[PDB]
Amino acid sequence: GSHMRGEFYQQLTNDLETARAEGLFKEERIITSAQQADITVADGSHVINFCANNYLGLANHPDLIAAAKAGMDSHGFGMASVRFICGTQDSHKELEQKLAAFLGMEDAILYSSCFDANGGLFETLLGAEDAIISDALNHASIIDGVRLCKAKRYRYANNDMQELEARLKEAREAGARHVLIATDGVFSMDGVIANLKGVCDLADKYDALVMVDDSHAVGFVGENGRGSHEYCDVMGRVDIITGTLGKALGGASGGYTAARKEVVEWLRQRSRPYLFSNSLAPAIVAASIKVLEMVEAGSELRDRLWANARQFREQMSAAGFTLAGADHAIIPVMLGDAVVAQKFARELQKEGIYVTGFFYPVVPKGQARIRTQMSAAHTPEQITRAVEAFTRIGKQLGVIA
Amino acid sequence: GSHMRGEFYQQLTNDLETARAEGLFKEERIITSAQQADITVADGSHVINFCANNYLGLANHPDLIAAAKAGMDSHGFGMASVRFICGTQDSHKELEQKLAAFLGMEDAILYSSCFDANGGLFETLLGAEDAIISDALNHASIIDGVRLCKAKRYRYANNDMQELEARLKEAREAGARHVLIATDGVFSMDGVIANLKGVCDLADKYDALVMVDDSHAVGFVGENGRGSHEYCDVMGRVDIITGTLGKALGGASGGYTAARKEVVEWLRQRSRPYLFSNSLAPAIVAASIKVLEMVEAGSELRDRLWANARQFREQMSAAGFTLAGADHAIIPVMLGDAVVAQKFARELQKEGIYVTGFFYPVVPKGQARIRTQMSAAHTPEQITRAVEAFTRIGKQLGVIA
Numbered sequence: 033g034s035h036m037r038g039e040f041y042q043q044l045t046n047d048l049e050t051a052r053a054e055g056l057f058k059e060e061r062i063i064t065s066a067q068q069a070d071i072t073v074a075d076g077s078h079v080i081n082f083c084a085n086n087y088l089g090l091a092n093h094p095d096l097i098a099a100a101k102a103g104m105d106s107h108g109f110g111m112a113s114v115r116f117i118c119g120t121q122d123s124h125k126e127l128e129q130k131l132a133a134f135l136g137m138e139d140a141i142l143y144s145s146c147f148d149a150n151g152g153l154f155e156t157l158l159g160a161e162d163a164i165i166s167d168a169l170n171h172a173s174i175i176d177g178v179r180l181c182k183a184k185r186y187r188y189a190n191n192d193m194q195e196l197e198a199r200l201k202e203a204r205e206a207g208a209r210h211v212l213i214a215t216d217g218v219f220s221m222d223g224v225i226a227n228l229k230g231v232c233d234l235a236d237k238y239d240a241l242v243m244v245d246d247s248h249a250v251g252f253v254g255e256n257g258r259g260s261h262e263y264c265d266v267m268g269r270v271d272i273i274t275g276t277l278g279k280a281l282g283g284a285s286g287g288y289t290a291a292r293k294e295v296v297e298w299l300r301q302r303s304r305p306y307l308f309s310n311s312l313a314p315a316i317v318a319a320s321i322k323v324l325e326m327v328e329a330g331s332e333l334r335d336r337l338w339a340n341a342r343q344f345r346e347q348m349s350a351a352g353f354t355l356a357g358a359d360h361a362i363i364p365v366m367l368g369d370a371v372v373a374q375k376f377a378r379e380l381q382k383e384g385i386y387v388t389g390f391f392y393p394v395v396p397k398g399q400a401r402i403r404t405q406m407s408a409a410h411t412p413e414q415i416t417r418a419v420e421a422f423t424r425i426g427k428q429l430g431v432i433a
Numbered sequence: 434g435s436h437m438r439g440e441f442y443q444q445l446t447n448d449l450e451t452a453r454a455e456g457l458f459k460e461e462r463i464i465t466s467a468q469q470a471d472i473t474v475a476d477g478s479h480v481i482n483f484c485a486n487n488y489l490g491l492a493n494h495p496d497l498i499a500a501a502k503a504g505m506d507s508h509g510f511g512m513a514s515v516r517f518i519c520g521t522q523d524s525h526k527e528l529e530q531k532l533a534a535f536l537g538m539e540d541a542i543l544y545s546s547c548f549d550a551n552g553g554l555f556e557t558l559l560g561a562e563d564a565i566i567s568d569a570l571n572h573a574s575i576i577d578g579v580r581l582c583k584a585k586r587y588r589y590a591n592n593d594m595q596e597l598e599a600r601l602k603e604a605r606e607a608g609a610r611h612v613l614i615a616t617d618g619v620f621s622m623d624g625v626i627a628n629l630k631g632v633c634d635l636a637d638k639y640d641a642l643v644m645v646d647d648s649h650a651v652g653f654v655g656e657n658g659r660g661s662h663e664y665c666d667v668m669g670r671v672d673i674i675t676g677t678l679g680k681a682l683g684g685a686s687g688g689y690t691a692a693r694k695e696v697v698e699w700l701r702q703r704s705r706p707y708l709f710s711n712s713l714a715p716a717i718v719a720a721s722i723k724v725l726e727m728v729e730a731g732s733e734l735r736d737r738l739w740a741n742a743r744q745f746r747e748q749m750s751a752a753g754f755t756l757a758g759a760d761h762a763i764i765p766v767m768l769g770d771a772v773v774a775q776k777f778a779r780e781l782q783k784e785g786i787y788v789t790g791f792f793y794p795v796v797p798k799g800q801a802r803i804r805t806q807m808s809a810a811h812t813p814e815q816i817t818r819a820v821e822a823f824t825r826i827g828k829q830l831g832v833i834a
């Protein structure tokens with residue numbers, strides 16, 4: 033019979049139509065240009081993109097494209113193999129060495145994404161006798177990595193050092209052997225930088241390891257763009273740092289875990305995504321080696337980005353919008369209702385501003401928002417223009433007075 | 434205090450030392466050339482690679498490199514965004530449409546790897562009231578995808594249709610709502626092709642969905658290279674098919690899930706790796722569109738691959754070796770002892786043959802082997818050389834008489 037399978041398919045169709053009615057259906061907008069500030073969409077119109085992880089504006093940089101091409105010319109198109117078989121080229125090692133040095137760590141191991149780095153981290157290093165204490169606002173990739181781990185789990189309210197301490201005492205009282213605190217370096221839907229000084233101080237007091245996902249920090253957060261550990265001045269106090277090559281560092285693909293030598297080598301020996309998934313492509317490896325140099329010499333880019341973030345926040349703050357977070361390129365405009373968020377975004381596009389509405393499940397129901405993201409590429413003029421558009425539409429939709 | 438953190442690092446060091454003592458430490462060998470049959474290693478010497486997923490020899494093909502370059506010239510280096518925000522270009526949709534048509538499915542959704550396509554599949558479609566029945570030999574990526582799902586789990590011995598039916602009865606009698614059978618199309622460490630005819634017939638009898646991971650079949654298995662569903666004559670009967678772009682289809686990176694339109698759209702709306710991980714890079718998207726045309730152009734590469742597989746299996750079997758599986762490019766030479774596998778691999782490189790030893794945890798302890806993989810790029814002479822080297826070393830080591 034096909035009664036149950038028929039139901040499976042019918043409920044999917046029903047649930048999709050229901051999502052649409054509730055303003056929860058994500059529609060993909062086709063972009064026909066390369067990733068940059070000024071993009072072109074399907075109908076050929078030009079709009080300013082204010083929602084990319086292209087923080088330093090390098091996603092379409094000539095130098096990275098050139099490096100990628102040179103990489104394919106000398107090292108090929110694909111490895112067609114996981115690292116331990118025949119997927120390790122000299123350039124993979126050069127990149128890992130360069131990454132470890134950049135982050136101030138002993139070694140680094142490559143993955144095809146930070147989602148995988150996180151997924152293949154916890155289960156490999158901790159077990160049933162251990163405990164993991166996570167910030168409740170942690171990224172989905174951290175949560176899923178922790179779900180695959182046998183360690184006892186505990187959670188503390190976002191940036192709440194009082195609860196973190198309570199959970200640490202709880203874990204230790206329960207007899208946990210090794211304890212690890214896991215937190216985003218920057219909470220991506222809120223534009224909030226973690227309180228790593230507070231976290232590390234507690235880690236010392238309770239003998240716990242510290243893991244930080246710096247996907248939305250590496251390359252532009254910190255005076256040398258090293259990440260949240262530099263920004264919070266706890267360099268050397270974070271045991272494990274994971275990151276991505278798909279954000280500020282090029283935006284193509286790839287991720288990694290940087291830590292002490294023992295951790296990294298054990299990950300190479302037992303991390304499932306590393307053992308059972310393709311090695312990073314030569315084009316990405318080559319371009320990533322080049323991007324780290326561009327980042328190290330990107331002080332002017334960071335200055336621009338930082339100036340852009342303060343301009344947009346200051347101006348939107350003056351306009352009366354409710355904005356989450358502080359001191360980061362991610363500036364979420366809080367709207368609550370998903371239908372209003374989608375409408376606001378569509379109206380903004382008519383005004384030449386490209387942003388996306390965020391709603392369940394990427395963010396909680398009732399807490400919909402438009403997460404804007406500044407880039408070093410944006411000009412003061414574009415930002416003023418975006419602000420004037422947000423203000424006009426915000427007033428028309430009853431979002432602001 | 435720091436007793437526990439100190440112990441954490443010491444134990445990792447102890448674990449590493451214990452691993453190499455038992456012949457379970459994987460050393461990576463640096464390759465300085467592009468991926469191909471005749472590769473170059475660190476010291477500049479040339480060796481023939483018989484352990485790559487480069488089934489059609491396209492990993493360093495000039496047409497793919499050219500397509501990748503053109504893709505970057507028009508679409509940039511990276512998307513620096515997940516698909517629903519600003520990571521969808523016209524080319525992403527084009528590739529998904531081409532993949533769907535190629536596989537004989539309604540639609541397809543791209544991921545950065547098949548590891549993640551599997552990881553983000555099950556949890557999104559099934560829940561606590563459902564059941565997943567898995568072939569015991571399933572790949573780690575399927576297993577980890579199932580581990581994130583709340584559905585009740587059942588396992589059946591590899592290719593055991595009797596036990597598969599037993600579990601289907603068990604699940605249904607237990608009151609399961611939706612039941613899904615999950616299986617590799619080709620089991621990668623053994624070179625065994627799944628019995629999809631038997632699986633699908635049973636799926637109909639018990640009203641169950643069927644999922645197949647065709648990573649080691651898409652592009653070269655089947656008269657038209659469509660995969661195990663074509664080979665087993667069950668095209669259209671497999672509800673969900675996942676695959677990779679990192680094997681026969683180029684070998685760079687990327688994965689996908691193909692299924693009915695409503696399944697695919699629901700995945701776009703709720704699959705975690707899709708919502709919270711970078712969109713596929715333009716270079717890979719472009720090259721992938723080209724590779725599908727290359728696979729379709731004719732049967733020449735597939736013919737050579739199968740002739741090569743036939744030759745190696747016949748010659749190695751006549752030479753006295755114990756081999757696993759049948760009828761596939763993957764031809765495992767069973768050695769049992771990890772120390773012997775490691776030694777055999779090293780001795781083979783001295784003879785100009787590059788293969789790798791496989792042991793715990795990639796395969797059970799006591800079941801070490803050297804998994805060879807034929808490629809359309811291999812020549813009859815290279816294979817004969819390989820067989821002669823294997824024979825010579827095998828006799829020297831006492832693996833064969």
Ligand SMILES: CC(=O)[C@H](NCc1c(COP(=O)(O)O)cnc(C)c1O)C(=O)O
Nearest residue numbers: 308309310546547548572621648677679
């Ligand atoms: C290369 C191997 O040794 C082989 N590959 C992994 C694999 C995947 C993952 O593909 P991605 O690189 O993540 O796109 C998916 N399914 C299967 C069945 C396999 O084998 C392996 O694991 O042996």
Ligand SMILES: CC(=O)[C@H](NCc1c(COP(=O)(O)O)cnc(C)c1O)C(=O)O
Nearest residue numbers: 145146147171220247276278709710711
């Ligand atoms: C692009 C977003 O909207 C943002 N990015 C994801 C993310 C990752 C995954 O990086 P990969 O693309 O897998 O290399 C890892 N950590 C964090 C903290 C985030 O946010 C997002 O999720 O909102």
